[PDB]
Write a protein that binds this ligand. Structure first.
Ligand code: BCL
Ligand code: BCL
Ligand code: BCL
Ligand code: BCL
Ligand SMILES: CC[C@H]1c2cc3[nH]c4c(c3C)C(=O)[C@H](C(=O)OC)c4c3nc(cc4[nH]c(cc(n2)[C@@H]1C)c(C(C)=O)c4C)[C@@H](C)[C@@H]3CCC(=O)OC/C=C(\C)CCC[C@@H](C)CCC[C@@H](C)CCCC(C)C
Ligand SMILES: CC[C@H]1c2cc3[nH]c4c(c3C)C(=O)[C@H](C(=O)OC)c4c3nc(cc4[nH]c(cc(n2)[C@@H]1C)c(C(C)=O)c4C)[C@@H](C)[C@@H]3CCC(=O)OC/C=C(\C)CCC[C@H](C)CCC[C@H](C)CCCC(C)C
Ligand SMILES: COC1=C(OC)C(=O)C(C/C=C(\C)CC/C=C(\C)CC/C=C(\C)CC/C=C(\C)CC/C=C(\C)CC/C=C(\C)CC/C=C(\C)CC/C=C(\C)CC/C=C(\C)CCC=C(C)C)=C(C)C1=O
Ligand code: HEM
Ligand SMILES: CCCCCCCCCCCC[N+](C)(C)[O-]
Ligand SMILES: CCCCCCCCCCCC[N+](C)(C)[O-]
Ligand SMILES: CCCCCCCCCCCC[N+](C)(C)[O-]
Ligand SMILES: CCCCCCCCCCCC[N+](C)(C)[O-]
Ligand SMILES: CCCCCCCCCCCC[N+](C)(C)[O-]
Ligand SMILES: CCCCCCCCCCCC[N+](C)(C)[O-]
Ligand SMILES: CCCCCCCCCCCC[N+](C)(C)[O-]
Ligand SMILES: CCCCCCCCCCCC[N+](C)(C)[O-]
Ligand SMILES: [Cl-]
Ligand SMILES: [Fe+2]
Ligand code: NA
Lengths: 267, 246, 281, 124
């Protein structure tokens, strides 16, 4: 019935509300961390001193390619990995849903959900979408500190050097751009805080000298500027393009293009 | 008969990008446009970007609405006069920049009401009226003498105006010699051990600081008057600023 | 050619050099003494690049590439066609960047705002100089600097990287990265928070900054406030570039082997170095 | 069969981010001027860790050549799948480390590339 939902809907952690989707997410998030810790302790021979010295070297690898997209692999040969991915899939998606309903509850736009969705997009391509299009779980990313890095290094070399993948190049421009853009903005708002500049919502509803000086600073500098609201529209796009363009760039690696260097010499 | 899916996608992206930039640039034209001649008349040459369609903003606490883009509000005589017959040169103040409100001393005709918080109460309140705010930020300025860049005392700290919601001090209230009080922006004062130093203003410019009506609340318009004025002193109170500034 | 509120701000003063000589605009752009300075440096460099493209014989922007002197030159000069142009172009580039920053300072003065912007920009310049000046000078040769070419500089990143195995193992590189990612995540959230409040569900009033706080704390666990969030963004962004500079000024100057070997100091700690088992046992 | 030169030539592309194949005349058979790894021309039947120009050989690689390791298809295929594991076994040592930071997954490509090396990288 509704009483149960209502009961969960009032779940909290101090003054912050967790709600139904939040409880399912934290629970789902624990099982994930429990599946990886259980495998890590095993690899450490249940020895805490070994667990701490090799912490970064442990890795929960995916099923071998001979298993395709099946769920046959035994626990210690891809079984655990599959379980951990399931739980993580639910934790993330539950949290996404929580962000959508919470915005709805406070009567706000869904901008946060949309931006989050872009991050989820790259994650979905690395561990779910791409492996399925390649035909095997073995193509997915391992759960480990150093191992997922080794995975990243190998993925590039195998595909002809990702520096030649135009989408990896766009993704980078946007990553640097995000840093270039938060420095400018963060610095612009601090430079006019002496005029209440940080109160952006009020500067939008009733422009002040702080917002005008921010604009003129850049107009005189680079020839153009933005408004107190529009600046945040550049910000959200500059940041979501990082994972949008790159997800596309990885989804194209190995499925459409085998060697980016070669592809690049042709175009 | 096929095609390269990668060359297609990277081609589609740039189209999308060009389209995104157009959207973003027109979106940033809800304030300040149309452009004008240094005279005040439209420029006719507004550029390759057109103004967006009007959007209405419904202000909370029943403060009304706001539609942009629209008629440029900016209303108050600008005590500035041409310096050249050609465009692209400075406009020199005709009177007293500090008192006229131009240059780094400029302020904007904002709504003459205080900023409200979620509950509908004033966002900024004098600490000796706050709902239980104690001075634990470190050093307490209440009681200290305030001096200017001329190295002369202009008054003393009487109270602290705190921003309830964000919970931080935004103004230092200082009693001038004549007994009347003025508000000083926290970002414009340095609270020392035995005093408060204000490098943006000269002791004799403290009186010129715009005053607030209700002695318990400050409105947006009053905030711009004060801040624009205090900040303008960095440039205009320069001839009276003593060296060894630190 | 002015925004509807610009006029009252276009007063005289603020310049750091030349008094009123250059204190004027040109369209939307302010000039100032450092305005012509930037143009001077910028033009000369743009001309030396076009010249180098002639020596190289090609107008293809995808192929033009100005290379630094060959290692056999150390830190001395070099023929114009063999690195000399690279050295001159780097001077003009540093001059143009610096002038650009000083020109923002003048603009800050005239406007009565803080110096945070040119301060922040300076971090970017030090990172640039770290790759073309400090690091090369610490290693004994200009040849260690990267080349000026759209694609040749990416190859330089790749070769330098692999010179030390997988560069992912550089600890300062790991930290820089986490900052770049955390910055982008922060930027996304901030942008989305302001917008979701200014543009609520149709029919509703704009949301309050408290609604914004309420939602932000429901996501991260703590409320940071409007001033705190812009400070965090600038902080994250600057730290990223700080640690990047750091990860490179140390590579090939005090660390010479494959970066992964560095993590031995931790596996080889007294109390667990010899315990059998694990991955390194 | 048991190795395809043409498929080996294509698979060898991923190796060009670090290796090159340049004969003794100075002519490039394959490569983009990569210098991270040694020149592979003449590697077939060569003693591991001895390409005259490569100055970045590790100790494990060099001690394997000293123990008489000469490249053939058998050892070649094992090494490219995991340079470190391969060098640890062969050398006998346990803390032996390989400097090649790449792993060829498919054993088929290992044989194909080797067939490509015999076709263009054998020093007569
Ligand atoms: C330590 C980091 C490495 C490095 C690693 C990489 C990697 C990795 C990549 C790039 C990429 C790029 N790099 Mg780089 N790059 C370095 C230093 C530089 C310097 C410099 C003077 O220091 C410059 C001007 C560039 C410029 C560029 C751009 C051409 C390109 C994407 C823009 C970008 O990231 O914007 C961030 C800023 C913005 C988006 C804001 C607007 C800035 C505009 C876009 C810059 C114009 C650059 C212009 C074409 C060249 C100007 C020269 C003058 C005409 C003479 N790099 C250093 C040596 N660079 C990407 C690419 O696709 O390359 C082919 C890429 O993937
Ligand atoms: C040798 C290695 C290759 C290489 C191989 C790759 C590969 C392979 C990839 C990249 C990708 C990226 N590369 Mg690269 N890259 C190289 C060199 C570079 C250089 C450089 C100066 O050399 C730069 C600047 C970059 C930059 C980038 C970024 C633009 C991009 C990642 C976006 C991102 O951060 O998403 C961050 C966001 C996510 C990963 C989303 C997932 C997050 C999930 C949704 C949330 C988890 C919640 C969780 C439960 C809680 C866990 C908490 C933690 C335990 C703390 N690369 C070299 C040439 N690169 C990626 C790409 O294309 O991205 C688009 C990519 O796949
Ligand atoms: C394609 C790009 C690669 C990748 C390349 C890198 C690189 C390169 C680095 C990291 C690093 C990190 N990665 Mg990773 N990482 C990838 C995908 C992931 C995913 C995922 C899809 O779910 C997660 C949860 C992580 C999580 C992490 C964090 C533990 C760590 C700090 C970054 C940060 O700011 O976290 C903020 C977290 C919460 C706010 N990575 C993909 C597969 N990652 C850094 C590190 O130190 O790694 C050891 C690092 O240098
Ligand atoms: C195979 C290659 C190696 C590798 C090799 C290297 C090397 C080598 C370097 C990095 C560096 C970096 N790497 Mg790495 N890196 C690898 C993989 C990665 C991955 C990943 C997902 O795999 C990531 C996320 C990163 C991330 C990073 C960044 C932390 C760092 C970039 C510094 C920076 O942003 O300066 C940003 C700021 C600047 C570059 C300032 C310069 C800008 C100037 C001041 C302004 C330009 C003005 C312009 C001329 C005018 C524009 C035109 C006008 C508008 C018309 N690397 C792989 C493992 N990496 C670099 C670093 O730390 O550098 C210090 C570096 O040198
Ligand atoms: C914390 C540091 C971050 C940051 C901050 C930052 N950048 C800034 C600012 C700030 C605060 C500014 O105020 C300033 C700005 O005006 O706003 C856009 C700027 C700026 N950041 C820029 C670029 C930039 N920033 C970057 C990065 C970053 N900027 C960091 C992430 C990057 C990269 C690679 O990540 C780039 C490409 C410029 C657009 C702009 C400064 C404009 C400038 O300096 O102009 C000088 C003059 C010219 C127009 C001509 C230069 C022509 C020649 C003289 C030289 C070029 C030759 C050679 C050096 C280039 C070879 C290129 C090849 C490698 C392709
Ligand atoms: C535009 C892309 C960028 C981006 C955006 C982004 N990330 C986001 C969001 C947005 C808009 C959120 O709304 C969401 C968030 O709630 O943050 C406060 C989130 C988020 N980004 C996260 C991580 C993250 N984002 C990353 C990257 C990025 N996020 C990009 C740079 C990275 C990397 C690899 O760089 C990581 C590791 C999570 C902290 C958070 C989503 C939380 C989540 O899914 O939780 C589910 C699971 C649990 C509760 C498990 C807890 C485990 C046990 C300790 C208990
Ligand atoms: C709340 O405040 C703020 C504003 O105003 C309300 C602003 O405008 C800005 C400024 C930011 C923008 C207008 C967004 C667009 C800018 C970027 C994404 C940064 C990259 C910059 C460029 C491509 C322009 C480079 C141009 C130069 C250097 C001039 C040289 C000459 C060409 C003829 C910020 C940060 C801000 O915070
Ligand atoms: C591509 C699948 C590939 C092949 C094949 C390959 C082979 C190979 C051999 C046979 C050696 C030994 C050479 C000798 O003894 O003379 C060797 C050595 C190194 N390699 Fe390699 N290699 C391939 C790819 C790559 C890639 C992509 C890199 C760079 C990330 C790389 C690097 C190296 C290095 C370094 C060495 C020397 C190793 C040492 O001394 O331990 N290889 N490779
Ligand atoms: C693969 C799906 C990823 C979705 C990325 C969506 C980004 C949209 C972000 C909100 C855009 C807001 N707006 C109005 C300012 O443009
Ligand atoms: C208790 C150990 C905690 C291990 C945390 C491991 C984080 C590595 C994350 C990279 C794997 C990413 N993913 C989703 C693609 O699989
Ligand atoms: C909305 C922000 C506008 C940013 C525009 C950034 C352009 C940088 C382009 C880098 C060139 C990338 N590459 C490989 C595709 O050529
Ligand atoms: C009372 C609120 C007014 C804000 C005062 C700012 C205190 C932060 C001081 C550290 C920053 C110092 N500074 C000058 C180097 O930027
Ligand atoms: C509309 C296309 C005509 C382009 C006009 C641009 C002139 C600027 C040329 C500078 C770039 C020179 N080049 C070849 C070295 O790249
Ligand atoms: C020719 C002057 C030598 C100084 C070169 C330094 C340029 C960096 C300017 C950044 C401005 C920094 N700040 C906060 C002090 O104004
Ligand atoms: C006439 C071609 C149209 C011009 C397109 C613009 C290309 C930008 C070229 C600048 C490349 C400069 N360089 C040396 C750093 O590579
Ligand atoms: C995430 C990486 C941060 C780790 C910082 C490590 C600090 C411990 C440094 C001790 C290692 C000293 N050293 C030079 C001998 O290797
Ligand atoms: Cl919207
Ligand atoms: Fe903001
Ligand atoms: Na550790």
């Amino acid at each position: 019935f509704s009483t149960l939902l209502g009961w969960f809907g009032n779940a909290q952690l101090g003054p912050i509300y967790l709600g139904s989707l939040g409880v399912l997410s934290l629970f789902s998030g624990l099982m994930w961390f429990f599946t990886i810790g259980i495998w890590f302790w095993y690899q450490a021979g249940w020895n805490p001193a070994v667990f701490l010295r090799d912490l970064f070297f442990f890795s929960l690898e995916p099923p071998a390619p001979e298993y395709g997209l099946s769920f046959a692999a035994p626990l210690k040969e891809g079984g655990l990995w599959l379980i951990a991915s399931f739980f993580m899939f639910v934790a993330v998606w539950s949290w996404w849903g929580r962000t959508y309903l919470r915005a709805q509850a406070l009567g706000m736009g869904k901008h946060t959900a949309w931006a989050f969705l872009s991050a989820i997009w790259l994650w979905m391509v690395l561990g779910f979408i791409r492996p399925i299009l390649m035909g095997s779980w073995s193509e997915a990313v391992p759960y480990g500190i150093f191992s997922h890095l080794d995975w990243t290094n190998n993925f590039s070399l195998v595909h002809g050097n990702l520096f030649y993948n135009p989408f990896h190049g766009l993704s980078i421009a946007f990553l640097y751009g995000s840093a270039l853009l938060f420095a400018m903005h963060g610095a612009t708002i601090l430079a006019v805080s002496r005029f209440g500049g940080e109160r952006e919502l009020e500067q939008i509803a009733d422009r002040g000298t702080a917002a005008e000086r921010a604009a003129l600073f850049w107009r005189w500098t680079m020839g153009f500027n933005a408004t107190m609201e529009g600046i945040h529209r550049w910000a959200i796009w500059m940041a979501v393009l990082v994972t949008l363009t790159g997800g596309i760039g990885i989804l194209l690696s190995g499925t459409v293009v085998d060697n980016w260097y070669v592809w690049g010499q042709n175009h | 008969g096929n095609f390269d899916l990668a060359s297609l996608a990277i081609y589609s992206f740039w189209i999308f990008l060009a389209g995104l930039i157009y959207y973003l640039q027109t979106e940033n034209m809800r304030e300040g446009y149309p452009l004008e001649n240094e005279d005040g008349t439209p420029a006719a040459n507004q550029g390759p970007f057109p103004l967006p369609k009007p959007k209405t903003f419904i202000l909370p606490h029943g403060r009304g609405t706001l539609t942009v883009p629209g008629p440029e509000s900016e209303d108050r005589p600008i005590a500035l006069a041409r310096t050249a017959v050609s465009e692209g040169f400075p406009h020199a103040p005709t009177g007293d920049p500090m008192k006229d409100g131009v240059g780094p001393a400029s302020w904007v005709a904002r709504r003459d009401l205080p900023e409200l918080d979620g509950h509908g109460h004033n966002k900024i309140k004098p600490m000796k009226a706050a709902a239980g705010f104690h001075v634990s930020a470190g050093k307490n300025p209440i009681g200290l003498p305030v001096r200017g860049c001329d190295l002369e005392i202009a008054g003393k700290v009487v109270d602290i105006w705190v921003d309830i919601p964000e919970q931080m001090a935004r103004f230092l209230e200082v009693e001038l010699k004549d007994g009347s009080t003025r508000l000083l922006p926290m970002q414009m004062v340095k609270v020392q051990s035995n005093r408060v130093h204000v490098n943006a203003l000269s002791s004799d410019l403290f009186a010129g600081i715009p005053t607030i009506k209700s002695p318990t609340e400050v409105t947006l318009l009053e905030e711009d008057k004060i801040c624009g004025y205090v900040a303008g002193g960095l440039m205009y109170a320069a001839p009276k600023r003593k060296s060894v500034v630190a | 050619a002015l925004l509807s509120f610009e006029r009252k701000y276009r007063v005289p003063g603020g310049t750091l050099v030349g008094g009123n000589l250059f204190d004027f605009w040109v369209g939307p752009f302010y000039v100032g003494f450092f305005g012509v300075a930037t143009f001077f440096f910028a033009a000369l460099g743009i001309i030396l690049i076009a010249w180098s493209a002639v020596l190289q014989g090609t107008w293809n922007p995808q192929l033009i590439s100005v290379y630094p002197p060959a290692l056999e030159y150390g830190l001395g000069g070099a023929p114009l066609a063999k690195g000399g142009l690279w050295q001159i172009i780097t001077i003009c580039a540093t001059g143009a960047f610096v002038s650009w920053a000083l020109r923002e300072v003048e603009i800050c003065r005239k406007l009565g705002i803080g110096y945070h912007i040119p301060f922040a920009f300076a971090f970017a310049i030090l990172a640039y100089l770290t790759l073309v000046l400090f690091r090369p000078v610490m290693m004994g040769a200009w040849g260690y600097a990267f080349p000026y070419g759209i694609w040749t500089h990416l190859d330089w990143v790749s070769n330098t990287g692999y010179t030390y195995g997988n560069f992912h193992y550089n600890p300062a590189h790991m930290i820089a990265i986490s900052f770049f990612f955390t910055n982008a995540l922060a930027l996304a959230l901030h942008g989305a928070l302001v917008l979701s409040a200014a543009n609520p569900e149709k029919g509703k009033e704009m949301r309050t900054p408290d609604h914004e706080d309420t939602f932000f704390r429901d996501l991260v666990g703590y409320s940071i406030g409007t001033l705190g969030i812009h400070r965090l963004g600038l902080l994250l962004s600057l730290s990223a570039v700080f640690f990047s500079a750091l990860c490179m000024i140390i590579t090939g100057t005090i660390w010479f082997d494959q970066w992964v070997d560095w993590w031995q100091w931790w596996v080889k700690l007294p109390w667990w170095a010899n315990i059998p088992g694990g991955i390194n046992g | 069969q048991e190795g395809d030169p043409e498929a080996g030539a294509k698979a060898f592309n991923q190796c060009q981010t670090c290796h090159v194949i340049v004969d003794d005349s100075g002519t490039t058979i394959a490569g983009r001027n990569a210098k991270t790894g040694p020149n592979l021309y003449g590697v077939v039947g060569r003693t591991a860790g001895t390409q005259a120009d490569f100055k970045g050989y590790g100790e494990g690689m060099k001690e394997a050549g000293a123990k008489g390791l000469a490249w053939d298809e058998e050892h070649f295929v094992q090494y490219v799948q995991d340079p470190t594991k391969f060098l640890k076994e062969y050398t006998g040592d346990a803390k032996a480390k390989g400097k090649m930071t790449f792993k060829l997954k498919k054993e088929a490509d290992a044989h194909n590339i080797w067939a490509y090396l015999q076709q263009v990288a054998v020093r007569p």
